Amino acid sequence: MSRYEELRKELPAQPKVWLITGVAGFIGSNLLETLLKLDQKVVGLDNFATGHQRNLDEVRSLVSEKQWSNFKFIQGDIRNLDDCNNACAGVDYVLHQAALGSVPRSINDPITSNATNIDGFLNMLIAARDAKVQSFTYAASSSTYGDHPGLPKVEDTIGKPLSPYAVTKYVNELYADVFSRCYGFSTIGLRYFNVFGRRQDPNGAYAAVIPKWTSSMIQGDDVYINGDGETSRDFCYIENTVQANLLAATAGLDARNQVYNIAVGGRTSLNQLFFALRDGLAENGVSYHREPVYRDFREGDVRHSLADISKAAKLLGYAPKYDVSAGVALAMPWYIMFLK
Amino acid sequence: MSRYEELRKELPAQPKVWLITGVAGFIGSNLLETLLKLDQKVVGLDNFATGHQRNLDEVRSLVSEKQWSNFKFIQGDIRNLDDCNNACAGVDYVLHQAALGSVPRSINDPITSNATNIDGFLNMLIAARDAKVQSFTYAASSSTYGDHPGLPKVEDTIGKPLSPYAVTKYVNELYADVFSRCYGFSTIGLRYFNVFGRRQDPNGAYAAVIPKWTSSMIQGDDVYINGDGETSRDFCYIENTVQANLLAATAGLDARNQVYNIAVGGRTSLNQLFFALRDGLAENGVSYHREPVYRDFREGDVRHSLADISKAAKLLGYAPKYDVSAGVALAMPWYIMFLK
Ligand SMILES: NC(=O)c1ccc[n+]([C@@H]2O[C@H](COP(=O)([O-])OP(=O)(O)OC[C@H]3O[C@@H](n4cnc5c(N)ncnc54)[C@H](O)[C@@H]3O)[C@@H](O)[C@H]2O)c1
Ligand SMILES: NC(=O)c1ccc[n+]([C@@H]2O[C@H](COP(=O)([O-])OP(=O)(O)OC[C@H]3O[C@@H](n4cnc5c(N)ncnc54)[C@H](O)[C@@H]3O)[C@@H](O)[C@H]2O)c1
Ligand SMILES: O=c1ccn([C@@H]2O[C@H](COP(=O)(O)OP(=O)(O)O[C@H]3O[C@H](CO)[C@@H](O)[C@H](O)[C@H]3O)[C@@H](O)[C@H]2O)c(=O)[nH]1
Ligand SMILES: O=c1ccn([C@@H]2O[C@H](COP(=O)(O)OP(=O)(O)O[C@H]3O[C@H](CO)[C@@H](O)[C@H](O)[C@H]3O)[C@@H](O)[C@H]2O)c(=O)[nH]1
């Protein structure tokens, strides 16, 4: 039994109050589903900028009526200090996921990304701190590694940001560290590495590669590969990311004011992904015979990204049990039902 | 003749349009005085948050009526993108000084500091970029060195921030670098090291050590030393900082998208400063016989700060001609006239 498995068993016995910002988004709604199923009490904050009411509706259809009543939802904005203080009222653990992802988005509109990702992040720290919360866990990013080529990726060795988005995610780490030095408010930042799974928005022009591609194959549209397709990623199935969050939310002091890489330590080239998704969809009765259409590399894009999760395994007892294949197998059916 | 001296002679012959944000503040009004005297055209942006109309009035009394008419003032906020675009209209060189200094201030109120220092800074980059400006120079800070003990300070070796303020100043560098990578908008950031001189506000609870102490001695109040007084600084007289600004605003491409240390490479302990100011005031007919009152170190304060200006001397031809003594001698008379 891993530390998470035992935690899964302990939580329902000693229920706590959790706060999930960006609860209507991909990662947020998944965290919600898991916590409500662990009979925890959850408060959610979201403004629907990129999240959806359907994500909340889907969760309700997946959890028991009782567990769903343990959920309090607040339609607010983390850029509004009032909404933050409100969402942190009497909360035990904060899981901050509210943000505006997508490098391309931040590049053609750095101001809008800055407002939520940095101002909003800072408001949450103050509100969480002032609410005397027990723990604060926030979504960081592997983009912080920037240009630095070296592999695997180690937490202490980072490169220079390659985009506005990357800057904001790195600033979340900076402010987190300072709040620890100046107020003794320790946090735990999780550097996610390409998370995927159910409820990750396939629509919009900034959709992630997996949702975008899976959606396109089901619809029979062309699939675009930015570059030669040799670009590699450490795709982390949602379930592994959920584990890290709960783990960080309840870690010992020795593990606080620390940032961790959250992935599986695997390497998947975009070319492998194309076939993984296509074959995965084929097992579900979806035929796709189109070849991938290769176009130019995308700006502010990283070449390779492999994570060393030994720090997370060692200090948090993080033990991911889902490789890309398992995740893809679990995800594909969902998208087919979503697009039907 | 230094590169600045020749630049002093060249500018009046080929006048350019300059933009100074925070033009009503200490460093900003001094830059204004110098530029107007070099017969340059200047646009100023300020909201008087910490600046003063008197600083502008003093400048008017110091420059010719003709040179003063070459000045356009805009009462605006860099947090307002409209005001930024307005201030950058048809501008050649941008000297961004608008910000909210003071570590103590950012510590007891990180949100207010974040808004101006990061959001406002980002708006200026966009507006300067969209206005097709020829150069963008911004006020950085030696605080970016943070904890790192090593001396002298070298631009490539920085430590971890010790306060919210330090974070914002470091983020100005981050966004500046990214704007160079993504838009080809190169900038030059100047890491100032404790600037002082005429018009540096002696009032308020966040006043810098020199203005605060000088003011207190003239008034006959007690002088407080936070710590043992062995805390050392590289006090940089305003005139040296002005040189760096104009130098950076007109530097060759090889010098762009680069950050520089701006000081004199000198080391002055707070204990030496106490006597430098007191003796300096004594030469002007001001008697002070009180001994300094030592109290606890101030939070988010750096122990020692010495700068290696060789990078600035080498790439910008920076050649400061004012040590603390000269600066103090020039400053003291001003404060005596200000408090009278
Ligand atoms: N998905 C990945 O692979 C990945 C990788 C690295 C980091 N992250 C981070 O994980 C977090 C969640 O990502 P996600 O993929 O679930 O995206 P998502 O867009 O599905 O979730 C983000 C949610 O935050 C909400 N939000 C945005 N701005 C808000 C504001 N100002 N006030 C209130 N709510 C606001 C949105 O409505 C949305 O529901 C983000 O912070 C992101 O930066 C994700
Ligand atoms: N003085 C030093 O020793 C020192 C050291 C390192 C960095 N700096 C930097 O130099 C710059 C100028 O410092 P200064 O000592 O002349 O301070 P100052 O307070 O005298 O000047 C700052 C000016 O900016 C204006 N301002 C602030 N927020 C604004 C906003 N949101 N919109 C428009 N105007 C705004 C203020 O009204 C003020 O006049 C600052 O950016 C500071 O961070 C100064
Ligand atoms: O239609 C498409 C979409 C994407 N890609 C490529 O696939 C790779 C991955 O795309 P993406 O899912 O956007 O990954 P990232 O650029 O690593 O961004 C991920 O990681 C970022 C920082 O960690 C987060 O902000 C994003 O939410 C998350 O998608 C990139 O090389 C893209 O160029 C394609 O080839 N074709
Ligand atoms: O009444 C006083 C005021 C200050 N100090 C000390 O004197 C030193 C210098 O004070 P200060 O002038 O506030 O210097 P910094 O803390 O280095 O801040 C300077 O450098 C910062 C970052 O570079 C800028 O934000 C500020 O505007 C600028 O004052 C510090 O150790 C203070 O503790 C005293 O002992 N007594």
**Residues B178, B133 share a domain:** yes
CATH of residue A93's domain is 3.40.50.720
> β-pairing, B232-233 with B268-269?
antiparallel
- Output the CA torsion sign for B121, B125, B131, B133: positive
Whether residue B97 has its Cβ less than 6 Å from ligand 4: no
Number of domains in chain B: 2
CB B88 within 8 A of CB B127: yes
Strand partners, B237: B196
Strand partners, A192: A141, A262
Euclidean distance between CA atoms B330 and A164, whole angstroms:
43
Euclidean distance between CA atoms B60 and B73, whole angstroms:
12
**A288 three-state secondary structure:** coil
Dist. CA A99 → ligand 1 center (Å):
4
Report the run of H or E that residue B57 belongs to, with start and end: helix B53-62
CA atoms within 13 A on the CB side of A200: 27
- A178·B163 Cβ contact <8 A: yes
Backbone φ, ψ for residue A56 (5° rounding): -70, -40
CB A231 within 8 A of CB A269: yes
**Residues B219, B152 share a domain:** no
Euclidean distance between CA atoms B114 and B106, whole angstroms:
8
Report CA dihedral (B144, B149, B154, B159) to the nearest 10 degrees: -40
Euclidean distance between CA atoms A83 and B221, whole angstroms:
45
Instruction: Tokens for A4, please give them.
Output: 């998470």
Cis link prior to A152 (omega < 30° from 0)?
A: yes
**Residues A146, A285 share a domain:** no
**Residues B332, B201 share a domain:** yes
- B162·A171 Cβ contact <8 A: no
CB A238 within 8 A of CB A327: yes
Decide if B108 touches A, using CB distance below 8 A. Answer: no
Dist. CA A9 → ligand 2 center (Å):
54
**Residues A287, A171 share a domain:** no
**Residues A138, A12 share a domain:** yes
Is A4 a residue of the active site?
Answer: no
DSSP state of B307: B
CATH of residue B219's domain is 3.90.25.10
The technique is X-ray
Which residues of chain B lie closer than 8 angstroms to A177, CB-CB?
Answer: 160-161
Write the CA distances from B223 to A318, B213, B235, B273, integer angstroms: 54, 6, 18, 12
**Residues A284, A203 share a domain:** yes
**A226 three-state secondary structure:** strand
Which has the closest alpha carbon to B100: B177, B18, B166, B19? B166
CB B94 within 8 A of CB B130: no
Nearest to B118 among A107, A118, A170 (CB): A118
Which residues of chain A lie closer than 8 angstroms to B164, CB-CB?
Answer: 175, 178, 182
**Residues A22, A69 share a domain:** yes
- Output the CA torsion sign for B272, B277, B281, B287: negative
The single-letter code of the amino acid at B146 is G
Which has the closest alpha carbon to A127: A71, A51, A185? A185
Whether residue A113 has its Cβ less than 6 Å from ligand 1: no
Q: Ligand 2 — pocket residues by CB below 6 A?
A: B 22, 24-28, 45-51, 77-79, 97-101, 116, 120, 139, 141, 192, 194-195, 201
CB A274 within 8 A of CB A223: yes
Cis link prior to B161 (omega < 30° from 0)?
A: no
Range of the domain at B232: 193-237+264-307+323-340
Report the run of H or E that residue B43 belongs to, with start and end: strand B41-46
Dist. CA A245 → ligand 4 center (Å):
40
**Residues A83, A219 share a domain:** no
CB B195 within 8 A of CB B236: yes
**Residues B291, B154 share a domain:** no
**Residues B73, B184 share a domain:** yes
- A167·B174 Cβ contact <8 A: yes
Report the run of H or E that residue A243 belongs to, with start and end: helix A238-249
**Residues B219, B335 share a domain:** yes
Euclidean distance between CA atoms A229 and A269, whole angstroms:
7
